[PDB]
UniProtKB/Swiss-Prot annotation:
Organism the protein comes from: Geobacillus stearothermophilus (Bacillus stearothermophilus)
Name of the protein in question: Large ribosomal subunit protein uL18
Positions spanned in the full protein: 24 to 120 of 120
Family that this chain belongs to: Belongs to the universal ribosomal protein uL18 family.
Modifications the protein undergoes after translation, according to the UniProt entry: The protein, when overexpressed in E.coli, contains a phosphoserine, which is required for the protein to bind to 5S rRNA. It has been suggested, based solely on amino acid conservation, that this occurs on Ser-34.
Molecular functions (GO terms): 5S rRNA binding; structural constituent of ribosome
Regions annotated as coiled coil: none
Upper taxonomic lineage: Bacteria, Bacillati, Bacillota, Bacilli, Bacillales
Biological function: This is one of the proteins that bind and probably mediate the attachment of the 5S RNA into the large ribosomal subunit, where it forms part of the central protuberance.
Gene that produces this protein: rplR
Keywords attached to this entry: Phosphoprotein, Ribonucleoprotein, Ribosomal protein, RNA-binding, rRNA-binding
One GO process term, biological-process aspect: translation
Assembly with partners or alone: Part of the 50S ribosomal subunit; part of the 5S rRNA/L5/L18 subcomplex. In B.stearothermophilus only 2 proteins, L5 and L18 have been shown to be part of this subcomplex, unlike the case in E.coli and T.thermophilus where L25 (TL5) is also found.
Any one cellular-component term (Gene Ontology): cytosolic large ribosomal subunit
């Protein structure tokens, strides 16, 4: 996120929704969590409940890293579907970036 597209990223990793926050122009987190996370274990991120578990944890630390939370990439939309949870966790936390 320093040439490609510095911002909170939200994409669907195969059958699960990967929540990924990458700093913008100031700073933030450069990681997150999805089905490939630990706390989730063997399959779980399929439902934002899990991806949101850590996807949010990383999110929180993200809004504080830079200054404020980051903005969803493209698959995050205004929030209403599934991917929304990821960008939402950061959203509700305070989406500014």
């Amino acid at each position: 996120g320093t040439t490609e597209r510095p911002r909170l990223s939200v994409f669907r990793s195969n059958k699960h929704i990967y929540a990924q926050i990458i700093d913008d122009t100031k700073s933030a987190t450069i990681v997150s969590a999805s089905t490939l996370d630990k706390e989730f274990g063997l399959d779980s991120t399929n439902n934002i409940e899990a991806a949101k578990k850590v996807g949010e944890l990383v999110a929180k630390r993200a809004l504080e890293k830079g200054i404020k939370q980051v903005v969803f990439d493209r698959g995050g939309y205004l929030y209403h579907g599934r991917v929304k949870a990821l960008a939402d966790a950061a959203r509700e936390a305070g989406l500014e970036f």
